[PDB]
Design a protein around this ligand. Structure first.
Ligand SMILES: CN1CCCN(c2cncc(-c3cccc(/C=C/C(=O)O)c3)n2)CC1
Length: 274
């Protein structure tokens, strides 16, 4: 610990989340990501099943840890006097969905379907493990290019999933639902579905539908690209103004636009050159 274990590479990115670096585990040459978070910037703290003070992000990552490849794996963590260091899985090669869409523009619907399905499975995994991500968006989705597999990353805005109201929020405003903007009140799953609607619009149109509070609150969706009627319907459903008018996860995955998804590997072969 910690230098005898990891070789630090270049910075991948920094922001509200902290600073993430490329790295390699010295023992086996495993690609890893090394994420640093200042203690002064951590607003919620949790306790591990063994009783120790860690950031909520650590709690949430451990709750979702499994063989399931749809969510990033926390491999190790360290406490420093002024920060926490998270050792995370790193697919190689990888590209985040924001960069992917920036490069390629609006995605073919077949590709968007495969990607969006995988995100749905990942988010359902989180919720099933009692975790609410709260920052679902293109930047927080990694594409494992060889395997055509998507990974949800950055649980730094997340919370334990509850059935009561959330009155706090620190994810991305332009993915946040109208009830947050207007009332500073939302429920977990229905807000999650809102952000999934933004994401899906983003995949098929190449950009997000709303930039300003007034637009989010109005909820009028305009399609700037050719999008099929079935996809438009699903997007408009996820983006229903009334939270209770939004589809459940089951209804999303049962939607006609979601039928006949490609497997991850088929997705890679067809769309990722692989
Ligand atoms: C939100 N992102 C902003 C865009 C640049 N950035 C990147 C870019 N490419 C890979 C990773 C990368 C690779 C492996 C694991 C992780 C996990 C990060 C996390 O869990 O916060 C991230 N992160 C930092 C985070």
């Amino acid at each position: 610990p910690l230098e005898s274990q990891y070789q630090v590479g270049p910075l991948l990115g920094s922001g509200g989340f902290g600073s993430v670096y490329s790295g390699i585990r010295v023992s086996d040459n495993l690609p890893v990501a090394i994420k640093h978070v200042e203690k002064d910037r951590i607003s919620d703290w949790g306790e591990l099943p063994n009783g120790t003070r860690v950031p909520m992000e650590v709690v949430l990552l451990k709750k979702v840890s499994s063989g399931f490849s749809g969510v990033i794996r926390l491999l190790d963590w360290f406490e420093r006097p002024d920060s926490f260091v998270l050792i995370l899985e790193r697919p190689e090669p990888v590209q985040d969905l924001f960069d992917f869409i920036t490069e390629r523009g609006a995605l073919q619907e077949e590709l968007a379907r495969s990607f969006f399905w995988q995100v749905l499975e990942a988010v359902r995994h989180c919720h099933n493990c009692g975790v609410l991500h709260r920052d679902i968006k293109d930047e927080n989705i990694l594409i494992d290019l060889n395997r055509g597999e998507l990974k949800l990353i950055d649980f730094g805005s997340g919370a334990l999933l509850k059935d009561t109201v959330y009155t706090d929020f620190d994810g991305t405003r332009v993915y946040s639902p109208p009830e947050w903007i207007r009332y500073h009140r939302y429920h977990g799953r229905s807000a999650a579905v809102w952000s999934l609607g933004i994401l899906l619009y983003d995949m098929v149109c190449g950009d997000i539908p709303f930039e300003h509070d007034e637009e989010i609150i109005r909820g009028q969706v305009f399609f700037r690209q050719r999008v099929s009627s079935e996809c438009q319907h699903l997007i408009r459903w996820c983006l229903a103004l009334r939270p209770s008018d939004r589809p459940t996860f089951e209804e999303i995955q049962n939607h006609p636009w979601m039928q006949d998804v490609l497997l991850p590997q088929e997705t890679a072969e067809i769309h990722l050159h692989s």
